[PDB]
Amino acid sequence: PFEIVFDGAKEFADLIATASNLIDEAAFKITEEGVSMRAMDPSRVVLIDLNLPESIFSKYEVEEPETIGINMDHFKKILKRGKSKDTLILRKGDENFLEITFEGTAKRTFRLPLIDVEELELELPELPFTAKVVLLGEVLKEAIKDASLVSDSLKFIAKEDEFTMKAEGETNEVEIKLTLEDEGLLDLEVEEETRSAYGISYLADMVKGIGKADEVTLRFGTEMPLQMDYFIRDEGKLTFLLAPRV
Amino acid sequence: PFEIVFDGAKEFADLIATASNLIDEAAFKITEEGVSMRAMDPSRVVLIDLNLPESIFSKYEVEEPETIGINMDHFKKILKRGKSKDTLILRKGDENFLEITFEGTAKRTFRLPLIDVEELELELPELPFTAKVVLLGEVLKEAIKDASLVSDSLKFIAKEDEFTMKAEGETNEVEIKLTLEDEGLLDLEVEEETRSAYGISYLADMVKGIGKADEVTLRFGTEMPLQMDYFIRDEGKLTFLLAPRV
Amino acid sequence: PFEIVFDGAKEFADLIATASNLIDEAAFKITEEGVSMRAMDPSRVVLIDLNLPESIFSKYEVEEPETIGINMDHFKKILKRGKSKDTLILRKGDENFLEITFEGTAKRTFRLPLIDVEELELELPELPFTAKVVLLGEVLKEAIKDASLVSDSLKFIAKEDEFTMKAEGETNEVEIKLTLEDEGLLDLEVEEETRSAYGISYLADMVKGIGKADEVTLRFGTEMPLQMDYFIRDEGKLTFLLAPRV
């Protein structure tokens, strides 16, 4: 048993909705320090790490650390019914379902049966990112979108004072450039000229759920994975780790 | 002949659009006291009563009480072309069509042939409602919508200080609760604990055309019909009478 | 080579998008006085004339007058990615593609291969328009739309103090009337009572890309073509010449 409460059900729906983009099924670790979740897409190309500490919850009462299995699509169809000014209550009895409550103009309660989830325990090799990039969400989603007009894959090129996302076609070619003079670029650190490429289908599902002025941080290296971070209520962290196109 | 005028064509389109949800064909009684319409859905599960008195019309000139037949879909495709600041003019000559005019930035006139409509004359048995409920439209449409995630039918349960719309599934279950402490509940009177169930497909079409902050009144009894009211310009009344699931 | 710049990429996308409605392929004449384009729909029923003078461009640098061929759909899929506050740069090297750049939160560059376009040189017979009409875009698009409920074709009837767009059916009939008392009518000059008819499918594609409060001027004559003008930044001119239904 636990009772966990989040003010603004529509925001929380958005996290879940984002993770649901690549995840079908996930195991949620619920501790007193917080809630965490680690899953992979079906193709095992994307890793997802979600970390929701106590501090972003209005009431966090975990008596008996616990892991629960959740079908991510049925969870997101339910959360999508919560409205922006609703209070969300995730609560668990001695049974095997998640109580999901929206409290706003009314008390609306759903019961979502908890499932049995394959808890693969695997993690990380070398993480020698030689590049760090912070940009506005709308650049990144624009970039994924423009490149999709042209190609399968998008190449990330980080140099000097330049970050470049480039895609090329059989006649067309697109290229998005960000220098520190640009409004869309919040930060750029480059230990070494770095080139790498990623599947646009994957990138696209990663950034669907990303907001207007959201700040996203990318870390990557030459022909190695792409790490994409963005923060939730300043203390939540959603991380994607994307395999490169080789 | 008659000339009837309504300021705000888009509002009137909305009534008609709502009634059109369950009605294909209808007969409109046009008198000097007002306009009224009584029809049933094809399955004869829902009764619709619409009452539009003189007082909600800017000009109401009925010389020769008259009943006219209208195809409800062709009427609603036409009314859907009227814009919010348009003045609506429903006018009839000695011919067999309805003149529908929108007057705004321009005079736009449609002619809708009047049809021959089966005027079944039937009405009401016992109406021993042991429960009355007034709630915000957005609760009701949220409620119909959440339950549709789970089930065929939605059970209405009115007790003490509680109103409850509940649906259950084969694994999932949803429940919407309203007490007078709640913002969404405007009024609750319960002569006796009352339980009854309704088809969600029917409920859904009943509340599609219902507005944000609209106030809806429900009256029902145990295993008997559901009456749903809401008002139009404070003096119009649209009523649904819904057969229970038995 | 040339460099041409337009502040507000989304506006320019809208011109192009409008012309693209009837045009698949077009040749763009680029001179020092401005940019112009003349094309016809596949059915050779509509003529399109587009004129974009230097004065509507923030930077206009044409060294070597030049004509370029453009696939209109690939150009409009690209321009549709420019956002409202973007600066648009159309630039050309000694190669055979158009550089399309959006400069805003970032530098986004597309390369659109220039094509080979059938440059038919044909133009105009008698232009004895006996009627001139200026109206709000929302009337015209409403009018095309209401008539589509009823018929293949829309008849334009200009008299005294009256302009009338009328369509009739096999039971239904629609009629839109504009007199100088009306808000939607900005101007009306009638040398002679004028009647003519046009295909609604064509009209509809002509006015899709037309704005809320846009002012459109129609000139036509009895059973002769319809000329439709509207202006861009007060000095751009997009013209349609539509064959009548005979």
XYZ file of C-alpha atoms in Angstrom, chain B:
246
model
C -47.362 31.287 -42.868
C -45.251 32.529 -39.975
C -42.085 34.528 -39.385
C -39.866 33.470 -36.491
C -36.574 35.154 -35.566
C -33.683 34.088 -33.297
C -30.586 36.198 -32.523
C -27.526 33.934 -32.549
C -27.877 31.345 -35.285
C -25.018 29.219 -33.905
C -26.894 28.724 -30.607
C -30.016 27.580 -32.324
C -27.946 25.305 -34.544
C -26.682 23.738 -31.325
C -30.197 22.855 -30.030
C -31.102 21.364 -33.345
C -27.744 19.629 -33.592
C -28.294 18.101 -30.143
C -31.800 16.812 -31.013
C -30.551 15.616 -34.373
C -28.185 13.259 -32.436
C -31.017 10.815 -31.805
C -33.650 12.085 -34.219
C -33.761 11.605 -37.990
C -37.175 13.098 -38.670
C -39.459 15.342 -36.602
C -42.746 17.243 -36.644
C -42.641 20.829 -35.379
C -45.765 22.304 -33.825
C -45.842 26.071 -34.459
C -48.328 28.026 -32.384
C -48.636 31.581 -31.071
C -47.482 30.458 -27.641
C -44.346 28.957 -29.142
C -42.656 26.123 -31.003
C -42.597 22.558 -29.753
C -41.339 19.238 -31.051
C -41.719 15.654 -29.888
C -39.868 12.785 -31.523
C -38.229 9.411 -30.831
C -35.028 7.791 -31.875
C -35.277 4.928 -34.428
C -34.908 2.307 -31.643
C -37.770 3.958 -29.700
C -35.543 4.015 -26.593
C -35.250 7.798 -26.257
C -38.013 10.352 -26.170
C -37.207 13.977 -27.064
C -39.264 16.949 -26.059
C -38.278 20.408 -27.229
C -40.135 23.576 -26.173
C -39.295 26.984 -27.611
C -41.649 29.717 -26.328
C -42.188 33.096 -27.971
C -40.101 34.794 -25.260
C -36.737 33.474 -26.586
C -37.493 34.848 -30.050
C -36.777 38.407 -31.118
C -39.806 38.404 -33.500
C -42.538 35.776 -33.307
C -45.412 36.136 -35.758
C -47.636 33.138 -36.121
C -50.805 33.757 -38.124
C -52.357 30.274 -38.549
C -51.147 27.641 -36.079
C -49.365 24.994 -38.116
C -47.355 21.761 -37.884
C -44.459 21.132 -40.232
C -42.362 18.095 -41.015
C -38.612 18.365 -41.078
C -35.777 16.059 -42.027
C -33.491 16.700 -39.085
C -30.197 16.101 -40.784
C -30.767 18.366 -43.695
C -31.946 20.978 -41.297
C -28.859 20.631 -39.196
C -26.472 20.683 -42.176
C -28.078 24.018 -43.091
C -28.176 25.496 -39.583
C -24.489 24.531 -39.140
C -23.734 27.217 -41.767
C -25.106 29.983 -39.566
C -22.451 31.832 -37.636
C -22.628 33.051 -34.021
C -23.470 36.705 -34.705
C -25.976 35.859 -37.429
C -29.673 36.550 -37.009
C -31.763 33.497 -37.848
C -35.070 33.833 -39.645
C -37.336 30.824 -40.004
C -40.111 31.892 -42.389
C -42.854 30.110 -44.333
C -44.925 31.074 -47.355
C -47.942 29.305 -48.881
C -45.522 26.790 -50.361
C -44.074 23.634 -48.768
C -40.657 24.661 -47.666
C -38.968 26.336 -44.774
C -37.104 29.528 -45.569
C -33.977 29.623 -43.492
C -32.137 32.927 -43.449
C -28.939 34.018 -41.763
C -28.587 37.821 -41.581
C -25.191 39.093 -40.620
C -22.405 40.274 -42.853
C -24.830 39.221 -45.615
C -28.342 37.849 -46.308
C -28.012 34.117 -46.882
C -31.177 32.200 -47.717
C -31.764 28.476 -47.906
C -34.978 26.732 -48.894
C -35.636 23.452 -47.080
C -38.543 21.411 -48.454
C -40.911 20.386 -45.697
C -41.574 16.640 -45.429
C -44.275 14.245 -44.324
C -43.582 13.009 -40.841
C -45.122 10.104 -38.968
C -46.978 11.876 -36.128
C -47.229 9.039 -33.551
C -49.277 10.292 -30.622
C -48.026 8.530 -27.475
C -46.798 9.678 -24.035
C -46.320 8.879 -20.334
C -46.999 6.086 -17.677
C -45.982 6.397 -14.014
C -43.346 9.184 -13.557
C -42.438 8.356 -9.913
C -38.915 9.750 -9.851
C -37.477 9.187 -6.389
C -34.336 11.152 -7.163
C -33.447 14.577 -8.562
C -29.932 15.638 -9.549
C -28.564 18.911 -10.912
C -24.968 18.865 -12.178
C -22.513 20.626 -14.449
C -22.564 19.473 -18.063
C -18.836 18.790 -17.965
C -19.282 16.254 -15.167
C -21.996 14.421 -17.085
C -20.045 14.361 -20.332
C -16.888 13.390 -18.446
C -18.865 10.636 -16.706
C -20.352 9.192 -19.913
C -16.845 9.277 -21.365
C -14.932 7.597 -18.557
C -17.492 4.818 -18.348
C -17.244 4.190 -22.084
C -13.653 3.144 -21.341
C -15.094 0.283 -19.285
C -18.581 -0.779 -20.269
C -21.814 -1.019 -22.251
C -23.907 0.558 -19.539
C -23.668 3.111 -16.765
C -25.419 2.654 -13.449
C -26.897 5.738 -11.705
C -26.918 5.435 -7.907
C -28.464 8.189 -5.808
C -28.211 8.025 -1.998
C -27.978 10.314 1.005
C -25.509 13.058 0.154
C -24.060 11.069 -2.712
C -24.741 10.694 -6.410
C -22.871 7.939 -8.164
C -22.416 6.981 -11.766
C -20.698 3.615 -11.925
C -19.644 1.285 -14.710
C -17.766 -1.990 -14.363
C -15.903 -4.187 -16.815
C -14.238 -7.569 -16.904
C -11.106 -6.170 -15.306
C -11.610 -2.379 -15.224
C -14.154 -0.302 -13.272
C -14.963 3.392 -13.096
C -16.984 5.392 -10.612
C -17.872 9.072 -10.472
C -19.006 10.462 -7.120
C -20.682 13.804 -6.374
C -21.527 15.133 -2.920
C -22.837 18.614 -2.105
C -19.311 19.563 -1.069
C -18.436 19.131 -4.750
C -18.371 22.010 -7.219
C -19.971 19.933 -10.007
C -23.118 19.176 -7.985
C -25.625 22.037 -7.978
C -28.517 20.154 -6.300
C -29.522 16.731 -4.871
C -32.882 15.457 -3.581
C -33.384 11.771 -2.799
C -36.806 10.492 -1.602
C -35.445 6.939 -1.419
C -32.192 5.173 -2.351
C -32.450 4.845 -6.133
C -30.510 2.538 -8.520
C -30.882 2.287 -12.357
C -28.783 1.689 -15.529
C -28.617 3.193 -19.037
C -26.944 2.523 -22.357
C -23.812 4.611 -22.766
C -24.297 4.869 -26.547
C -27.567 6.647 -25.833
C -26.227 8.789 -23.020
C -23.284 9.826 -25.187
C -25.517 11.105 -28.018
C -27.681 12.890 -25.460
C -24.797 14.902 -24.006
C -22.605 15.531 -27.147
C -24.390 18.819 -27.722
C -24.148 19.926 -24.082
C -22.041 22.923 -23.064
C -19.129 23.554 -20.698
C -20.878 25.079 -17.656
C -24.416 24.064 -18.678
C -26.658 22.960 -15.820
C -28.403 19.626 -16.430
C -31.147 18.153 -14.260
C -31.603 14.397 -14.013
C -34.675 12.733 -12.555
C -34.920 8.986 -12.275
C -36.203 6.075 -10.210
C -35.179 2.484 -9.529
C -35.215 0.498 -12.793
C -37.385 3.157 -14.487
C -36.604 5.836 -17.155
C -34.079 8.693 -16.952
C -35.228 12.226 -17.545
C -32.614 14.721 -18.598
C -33.406 18.419 -18.810
C -31.505 21.475 -19.721
C -32.682 24.972 -20.482
C -32.246 27.285 -23.407
C -32.099 31.018 -22.892
C -33.528 30.198 -19.437
C -36.976 29.497 -20.992
C -36.402 26.908 -23.712
C -36.434 23.326 -22.454
C -34.879 20.290 -24.114
C -35.891 17.053 -22.477
C -34.693 13.493 -22.974
C -36.514 10.474 -21.584
C -34.279 7.416 -21.658
C -35.375 3.802 -21.216
C -33.360 1.908 -18.578
C -31.210 -1.164 -19.233
C -33.156 -4.139 -17.854
